[PDB]
Amino acid sequence: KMDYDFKVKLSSERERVEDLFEYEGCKVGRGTYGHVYKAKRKDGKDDKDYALKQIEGTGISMSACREIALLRELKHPNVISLQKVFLSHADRKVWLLFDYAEHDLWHIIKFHRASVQLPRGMVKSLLYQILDGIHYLHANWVLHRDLKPANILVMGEGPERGRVKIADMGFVVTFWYRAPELLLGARHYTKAIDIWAIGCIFAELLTSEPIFHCRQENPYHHDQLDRIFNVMGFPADKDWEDIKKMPEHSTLMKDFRRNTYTNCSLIKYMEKHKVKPDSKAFHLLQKLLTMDPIKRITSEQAMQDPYFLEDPLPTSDVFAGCQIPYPKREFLTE
Amino acid sequence: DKAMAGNFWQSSHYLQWILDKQDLLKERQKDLKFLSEEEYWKLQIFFTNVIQALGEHLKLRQQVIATATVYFKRFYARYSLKSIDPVLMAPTCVFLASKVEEFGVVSNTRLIAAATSVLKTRFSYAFPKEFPYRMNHILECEFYLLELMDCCLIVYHPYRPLLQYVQDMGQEDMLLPLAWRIVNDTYRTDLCLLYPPFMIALACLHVACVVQQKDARQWFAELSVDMEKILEIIRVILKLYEQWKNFDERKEMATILSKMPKPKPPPN
Ligand SMILES: Cc1ccc(-n2nc(C(C)(C)C)cc2NC(=O)NCCCCCO)cc1
Numbered sequence A: 001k002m003d004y005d006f007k008v009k010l011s012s013e014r015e016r017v018e019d020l021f022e023y024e025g026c027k028v029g030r031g032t033y034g035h036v037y038k039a040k041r042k043d044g045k046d047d048k049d050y051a052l053k054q055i056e057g058t059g060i061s062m063s064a065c066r067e068i069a070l071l072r073e074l075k076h077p078n079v080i081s082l083q084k085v086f087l088s089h090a091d092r093k094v095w096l097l098f099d100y101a102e103h104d105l106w107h108i109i110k111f112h113r114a115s116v117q118l119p120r121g122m123v124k125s126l127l128y129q130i131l132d133g134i135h136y137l138h139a140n141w142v143l144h145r146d147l148k149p150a151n152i153l154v155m156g157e158g159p160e161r162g163r164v165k166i167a168d169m170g171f172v173v174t175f176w177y178r179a180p181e182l183l184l185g186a187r188h189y190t191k192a193i194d195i196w197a198i199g200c201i202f203a204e205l206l207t208s209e210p211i212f213h214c215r216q217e218n219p220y221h222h223d224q225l226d227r228i229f230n231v232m233g234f235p236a237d238k239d240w241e242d243i244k245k246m247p248e249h250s251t252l253m254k255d256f257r258r259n260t261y262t263n264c265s266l267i268k269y270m271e272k273h274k275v276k277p278d279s280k281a282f283h284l285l286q287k288l289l290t291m292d293p294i295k296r297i298t299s300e301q302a303m304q305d306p307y308f309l310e311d312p313l314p315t316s317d318v319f320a321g322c323q324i325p326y327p328k329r330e331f332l333t334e
Numbered sequence B: 001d002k003a004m005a006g007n008f009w010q011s012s013h014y015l016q017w018i019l020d021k022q023d024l025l026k027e028r029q030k031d032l033k034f035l036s037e038e039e040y041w042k043l044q045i046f047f048t049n050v051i052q053a054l055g056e057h058l059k060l061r062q063q064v065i066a067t068a069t070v071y072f073k074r075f076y077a078r079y080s081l082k083s084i085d086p087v088l089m090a091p092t093c094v095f096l097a098s099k100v101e102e103f104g105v106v107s108n109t110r111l112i113a114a115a116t117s118v119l120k121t122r123f124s125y126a127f128p129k130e131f132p133y134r135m136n137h138i139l140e141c142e143f144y145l146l147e148l149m150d151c152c153l154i155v156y157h158p159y160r161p162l163l164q165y166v167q168d169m170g171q172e173d174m175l176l177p178l179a180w181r182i183v184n185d186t187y188r189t190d191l192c193l194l195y196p197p198f199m200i201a202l203a204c205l206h207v208a209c210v211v212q213q214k215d216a217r218q219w220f221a222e223l224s225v226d227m228e229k230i231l232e233i234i235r236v237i238l239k240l241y242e243q244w245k246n247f248d249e250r251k252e253m254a255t256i257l258s259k260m261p262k263p264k265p266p267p268n
Helices: A004-013 A062-071 A105-113 A120-139 A191-207 A222-232 A241-245 A249-255 A266-272 A280-288 A299-303 B012-017 B021-028 B037-057 B062-078 B086-100 B108-122 B135-148 B159-169 B172-186 B197-212 B217-221 B227-246 B249-259
Strands: A027-031 A034-041 A050-055 A082-088 A093-099 A152-154 A164-166
Touching: A050 A062, A062 A082, A062 A093, A062 B086, A082 B135, A105 A152, A105 A191, A120 A152, A120 A164, A120 A191, A120 A299, A191 A266, A191 A280, A191 A299, A222 A266, A241 A249, A266 A280, A280 A299, B021 B062, B037 B062, B037 B086, B037 B108, B037 B249, B062 B086, B062 B135, B062 B159, B086 B108, B086 B135, B108 B135, B159 B172, B159 B197, B172 B197, B172 B227, B197 B227
Parallel strands: none
Antiparallel strands: A027 A034, A034 A050, A050 A093, A082 A093, A152 A164
16 A cells, blocks of 8 residues: 555656666676676766676665665765665666775785786885775674775776775685684684785785785684794784683694694785894884783774884875876676 | 664755755645645545554564655655555565565565555555555565655664663663653654754653653753753644544545545546
8 A cells, every 4th residue: 555646756757777877797796795887977967987786685785775874874084885776666686886896905915926026115105095995894893804905996097096995895715814812713804814914915016926925725714824924924822812712712722733833923924025024113013913802902092103204104085196007997798 | 773773964964854844844835726725734644554464464663664655655755645555665665675674575475464564454535446556566666765765764763862861860671661652642643854963863762751640840940951842742743642632533535535635647
C-alpha cells in the first residue's frame, strides 16, 4: 500500500545513473567491493572525469550501509569524497559517484622500482598528506584498518593536481603492512595499527621495495613475523612489556629464539638501502615503526616532526609543478 | 568512542536536518485537511510507542530505537501519511537503523514475526487485522526512506551530552535516571527536528531538577548558551505531560487511524 501519485512523481524526478553518465567499457577497478568506472557526464556541462562505483551485491548490505553512512559525513582535502548516491530500483543495485584519481602509490612505486628512486621532495609531501588525512579520520574515531600503497590515491591533472586522497579499494592478500600485534592475535583494530602501516609505506617510498616483503604462505603468521624480526630485530622484554598478554605469545616462544636475530636492526636495514641513520627522515621512521603499539607516535605527533621543517618543505602538489611521468589507468575487459 | 562523535557542527544532521518550524507546519497542512492538529500529535505519540515496542521485542539498545524514531519523523516531516503506510515505515526504520548502528541485519523471519507479534499482543485495540506486509515490501520501503533522507544516516541524540552534564554536576546517581526518561519522552514531539541534541539534554536535565527539587540555578547560569531557547524546549516538555494526562491512547486511536488520508491505488 503506497500512493500512486507519490510513486510516479518520484520515479519521474529520480536521476538514473545510465541517463546522467557515460561508462560502458570504461572499467578501471574490479575487486571484493565491486566495480569502479571512469565516467563522463552526458549533458556536457564539464569534461571532468568521475569515479563511478557499483557496490558488490544488491540492496543495502552492511557494507553499502557503512560506506554511505561514513562518507556522507566525512569532509577533508586528503580523504576521497562522495558526490552522489544512486539507488537503482529495477535491479536493487547501489552506485556511488566519487572524485576520479588518476594515480596511486601502488602504480607510482612500481614505476620507479622498474628502473631512478622517488624524489625526496615527493616522499615528504606524500607522507605529510597521508598523515593529514589519517589525523582527520582518527580525530573522528574512524580507523582505516587496511592502509597500503593501493589505498593511497593521488590526483592527476586538473585543479587538485598531485593531492593525496585516502581510499579503501578492497582486494591477492598480503600481511606486509600488518603490525605485529595483529600477527600475534590482537582482537581489535587501533589507531596504532594504522600508524605502523604508514611507517611501512614511508619505508617503501624511501627504498622502493616493501620493508617486510614475504613469500605467499588464523591470526598467527610465522613467516611474516620472521621477516619483521630480520629487519627490526627480536624485541627485548624492556622494548615491549605487554607482548606477554598477546594470545599467541606462547606460540611465538615455541617457534622463535631471540639469538637468531642478534645482528638485526632497522639501522642496519636502512643503511643497506642508502638512507642515513642520523637523518631526520630515519628518526621519524623509527618512531612510526616501533614494535610496542603504546610506544608508537600518533599522526598529530608525526606531523609536528622537524623532518617537515627541514629543506625541502612539503607541497600541496606532490609533483611540485614537474611533468607527471606516470601513465594513466588502463581499462579492464572481462 | 563512536565514529563522528565530536562532529555535530559539520554533520549532515545539523546542516540539513535541523528544520525551520514554519516550513514543518506548512508541509503538515496537507494532512490537516483530514486530521485535526490534536489528532495529528496523537498519531505522533502512537507511532513513537510502536517503534519503542518493536525495538524492545527485537532487544535493541535505546540508541537504535532513537535513530529509527528520527528516520520516521524525518520521512513524514516532508511527506504525507498517505504516501507510504506508517505500519510499513515503522519496522523499516528499525531495520535500517539496526544496520547503521552496527548491531547487524535482523533476519527476515525475525523482523516480520516481531512486527506481527507486536501489533497483535500490544496494539490489538488499534489494529484488528494481522500485519499484512512481507519482507519484499520492507526492502522496497527501505529504498524510498534512504532517498528522502538524502542518505543522511548518522544521527546525534541527547543521551551523550546529558551524561556529560550530570557528571560535571557530580549528581549522576540522583538526576540521571529521571532525566533519561524525560529524554525518551521528548521523542513524542518534534523537538529532535527543531533543536540541537545538547539543548534538549539541558532542558530535560532542568525539568528533572525541578521535579526532584535540587537547586542548580548557579550551574545553569554559569553555562554559555541561549537560555531563551532552553525555555522554549521546557514549555514543550511541560505541555507534553498535559497532553499525556488527557490522551486516552487505547480508546481513541482506532478512530484516528481510520481518519488518516488513504493511498490512491493504480487506475487498473
Ligand atoms: C564497505 C566499505 C568500503 C569502503 C569504505 N571506505 N572507507 C573509506 C575511508 C574514508 C575510511 C578512507 C573510503 C571508502 N571507500 C572508497 O574509497 N571507495 C572507492 C573510491 C573510488 C575513488 C576512485 O577515484 C567504507 C566501507
